[PDB]
Amino acid sequence: LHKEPATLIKAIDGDTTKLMYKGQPMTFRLLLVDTPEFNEKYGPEASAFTKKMAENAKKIEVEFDKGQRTDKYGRGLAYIYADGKMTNEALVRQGLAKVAYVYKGNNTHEQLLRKAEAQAKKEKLNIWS
Numbered sequence: 001l002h003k004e005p006a007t008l009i010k011a012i013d014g015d016t017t018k019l020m021y022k023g024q025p026m027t028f029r030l031l032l033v034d035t036p037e038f039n040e041k042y043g044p045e046a047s048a049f050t051k052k053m054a055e056n057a058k059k060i061e062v063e064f065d066k067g068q069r070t071d072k073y074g075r076g077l078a079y080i081y082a083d084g085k086m087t088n089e090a091l092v093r094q095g096l097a098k099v100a101y102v103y104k105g106n107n108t109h110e111q112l113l114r115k116a117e118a119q120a121k122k123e124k125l126n127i128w129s
């Protein structure tokens with residue numbers, strides 16, 4: 001997989017963000033994770049976490065997987081990096097997302113994320129508390 005440039009347009013919630021990619025505004029949904037909706041428990045904490053991570057970054061990158069690049073809602077499907085740190089992974093490590101929506105052929109980082117989830121669960125963090 002390859003990292004490609006993007007810039008933050010606006011935070012949306014724990015697992016979606018609006019980025020400019022190839023010069024066009026796009027909503028990106030984070031591959032392989034599910035954060036609680038803002039209305040749910042830890043939803044606000046997930047939103048805050050992804051917003052902080054994206055806003056504080058000097059460099060955002062998007063990395064598409066091997067499969068579909070947009071979902072049925074027109075959202076881009078990617079792994080999103082903030083100064084080289086994967087947001088998808090960080091959310092899972094902090095107990096603010098669950099590994100989820102693992103579709104065949106867009107699942108390159110599945111096992112990296114499952115390892116983070118195991119750690120977060122061991123520490124009883126957030127969702128796992």
Ligand SMILES: Cc1cn([C@H]2C[C@H](OP(=O)(O)O)[C@@H](COP(=O)(O)O)O2)c(=O)[nH]c1=O
Nearest residue numbers: 029030031032033034071072077101103106
């Ligand atoms: C993460 C992801 C979600 N989706 C679709 C499946 C879900 O459909 P439904 O809307 O029919 O439930 C929805 C979940 O996204 P959200 O968790 O953002 O709601 O997005 C994909 O199709 N591919 C993906 O990789």
Ligand SMILES: [Ca+2]
Nearest residue numbers: 015034035036
């Ligand atoms: Ca969600």
